[PDB]
Design a protein around this ligand. Structure first.
Ligand SMILES: CNc1ncnc2c1ncn2[C@@H]1O[C@H](CO)[C@@H](O)[C@H]1O
Length: 149
């Protein structure tokens, strides 16, 4: 058995959706990310209120890909004023640090039975960018990702 996540009360987990595989590769390479304005604000608020007493995890998936592609931890607050045009499209304003934990493809079939009570009970696999995941469901997703071979 694996009881590691048991007793973790302090943790917040978000879905990250990307239209670009290039941005995923760049994120892995340089340990940085950027979301939408409203996505950034959501993530920044979670990171800042965590106050270092627990992790903010990010579950990454490319739109239309059929799989999640990995997990990173948010590792800084959002800097809203940074170099433009670093990503595939020039829509993004700002940057924050991340540390990647899993770089592995996990099919949606492996995760589609976990549903989110805060998103109308929809499969976690039908989430939008910066959808937050309740902690108990997040623990379930993490364990499946970690154990997928
Ligand atoms: C660098 N960051 C990013 N790169 C590519 N696509 C992103 C992104 N952040 C969000 N998205 C996607 O683009 C949409 C916003 O235009 C979001 O709902 C996501 O699906």
């Amino acid at each position: 058995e694996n009881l590691y996540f048991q007793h973790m009360k302090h943790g917040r987990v978000f879905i990250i959706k990307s239209y670009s595989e290039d941005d995923i590769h760049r994120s892995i390479k340089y340990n940085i990310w950027c979301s939408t304005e409203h996505g950034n604000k959501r993530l920044d608020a979670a990171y800042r209120s965590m106050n270092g007493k627990g992790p903010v995890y990010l579950l990454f998936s490319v739109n239309g890909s059929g799989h999640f592609c990995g997990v990173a931890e948010m590792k800084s607050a959002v800097d809203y004023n940074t170099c433009a045009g670093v990503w595939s499209q020039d829509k993004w304003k700002g940057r924050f640090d991340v540390r990647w934990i899993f770089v592995k493809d996990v099919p949606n079939s492996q995760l589609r039975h976990i549903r989110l009570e805060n998103n109308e009970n929809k499969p976690v696999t039908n989430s939008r960018d910066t959808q937050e995941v309740p902690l108990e469901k997040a623990k379930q997703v993490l364990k499946i990702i970690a154990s997928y071979k």
